[PDB]
């Protein structure tokens, strides 16, 4: 039963580690 909310309950070390992440492929891109 999860429509709009999947899984808010995490950590904020999980949290950052996600943030960089996508940060990480904005900036390198496909080159």
Known sequence: ???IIG???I?????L???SR???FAH???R
């Not at 950590?11 to 949290?15: D, Q, S």
């Open 1 to 3: 039963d999860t429509e």
């Open 7 to 9: 899984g808010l309950t």
């Open 11 to 15: 950590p904020p070390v999980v949290a």
């Open 17 to 19: 580690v996600v943030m």
């Open 22 to 24: 996508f940060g990480f």
């Open 28 to 30: 390198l891109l496909p």
